[PDB]
Design a protein around this ligand. Sequence first.
Ligand code: ADE
Ligand code: ADE
Lengths: 244, 246
Amino acid sequence: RPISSVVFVIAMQAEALPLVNKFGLSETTDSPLGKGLPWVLYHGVHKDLRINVVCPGRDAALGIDSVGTVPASLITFASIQALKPDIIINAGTCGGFKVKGANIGDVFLVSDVVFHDRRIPIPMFDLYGVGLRQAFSTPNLLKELNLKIGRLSTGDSLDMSTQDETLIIANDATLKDMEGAAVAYVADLLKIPVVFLKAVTDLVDGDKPTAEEFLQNLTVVTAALEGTATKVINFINGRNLSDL
Amino acid sequence: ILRPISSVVFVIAMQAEALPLVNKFGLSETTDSPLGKGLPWVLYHGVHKDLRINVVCPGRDAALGIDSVGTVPASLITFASIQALKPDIIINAGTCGGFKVKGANIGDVFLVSDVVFHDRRIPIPMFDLYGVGLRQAFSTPNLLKELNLKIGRLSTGDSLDMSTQDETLIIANDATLKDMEGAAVAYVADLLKIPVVFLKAVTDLVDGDKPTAEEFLQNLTVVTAALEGTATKVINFINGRNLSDL
Ligand SMILES: Nc1ncnc2[nH]cnc12
Ligand SMILES: Nc1ncnc2[nH]cnc12
C-alpha cells in the first residue's frame, strides 16, 4: 500500500505558514496532542495524502517559537502516537558550511544526522550522545528533484562554541540545526521513517554574523523551503516507501 | 474540593538510581507495558500507605544498551508519564555534580530551588532567555524544615563534562548543582501544569581535583544509597498531606 499520511515537524511558525497556505491547511481546534499545550497542529489533504504540520508553538513566558531539541522531540512523539503517520518530514531552516558546498537558499535532503553537543566521556555513552542516525533513504526523490544532500549536526545552541566546531568538523556535517537529531531519535524509537528538508539561511563558515544573516534571509528562504516541500509532497503522492 | 496527594511519579534517568528505591518500597516492574507499546521505558508501580508510587526510567538504549540519559529522553518519559499516570506531583531524583564553592559536598542530597539550562545558547534578544529556560521548583517549605536538606539552583546540559563555554554560563547563573535532565523535566511539568520537585545527590565536585567521570562513577553506588534514604523520607512526609501542606 502507498504512503497515505505525512506529518511535517516544523519548529517555527515562520517556516510553517508558507506550507500551511500552499496546501490550504487548517488549524486544528480539538487539542488532539493534549489539553493546555501551546503546540499548533495544521491539518489538510493534498491529493491522496493526509497532511499535518505540527509546531511547538509560542513559549508561554516569552512569546517566541519554542525551538530546540526538547520541544521538537515532544511534538514528534505526540504527533506520531496520535496520527500514526507513514512518514515524518522535519522541514526547517539551518546553517550551512560553504566549504561543504552549501549556499544560501539551498534546500538540502539529509543523509544522516548527529548531535554535536551531547558529550559524555564514558565508553558507550559517548556514541550514545552523538546519536548517529541515518535518514530514510529516498534515492528517487533525490534524483528527480535534484536536491543537494549532506550530513546534519544538531545542537541546542544557535552559535558555535570552539568545542562545538571541533566536533562538527570531525563529523563532517554540511548542515547545522537545533532539532534534527532529536526528531530522528524519536522517529527511531517509534519506528517511523523520517526525512529532512533543511534550507540554508546562513553560512557558519562565512563572514556575516549568524543571527543577523539568519533573520535577514528567513523570509525568502522559507519561501524556497515551501517550494521544495511542495515538490516533495507531490512526488510522495501515490507512492510507497519502497519507491522514494 | 482539594484532597490529599494520592499519586506520585518519580522520573529517574538511570536504572541504578531507581533500583535502590524500587527495592526499598518493593515496587514491581510492570510487564504489561503501561505507558507505551514498544518502548524501552521502564515503569515500576507499587503502593505505600495512602500513596500510589510510580517510578519511570528511560531504560536501555537499543543501540548501545546503556541508560538513555539526557534531556530528550527525560522530557519524553515525563510527558508520557503525566498523560498516562496523571500524578499529583513529580519528583525528579538522581545524581549530579556539585560546586564546592557553592557549599556542595559529596553525598549531599539537595532539594532544588529553581532550574536553568547552560547549553542552549541563543545569543539574541528574547531567545536567549528562552534557551536558559528558568523555572522554579514547587515550593515545599515544610518538607525542607523537616528534612533540612540543602538547597540550591540546578543547571542542566546534555554533556557530562564541562566546556569552557558551559563553565562561564554556570558560574554566571550561580548554580550549585549540575545535571543532565532537570531543566527538561521542569519544562514538561510546567507545560502540563504538574508540580515538580527535585532530589539531587552529589557524586562529584566539578570544581574539585578529581576527573568528573571518574569521581562520578566512583561514588555512584554509595551516593545512590543516600539518595534512596532521602527519597524514602520524602515519600513518608508527603503521605497524608495535600499539595498545600508540603
Ligand atoms: N547556524 C545555525 N545553527 C543552528 N541552527 C540554525 N538555524 C539557522 N542557522 C543555524
Ligand atoms: N558533573 C556532572 N555533570 C552533569 N551530570 C552529572 N551527573 C553526575 N555528575 C555530573
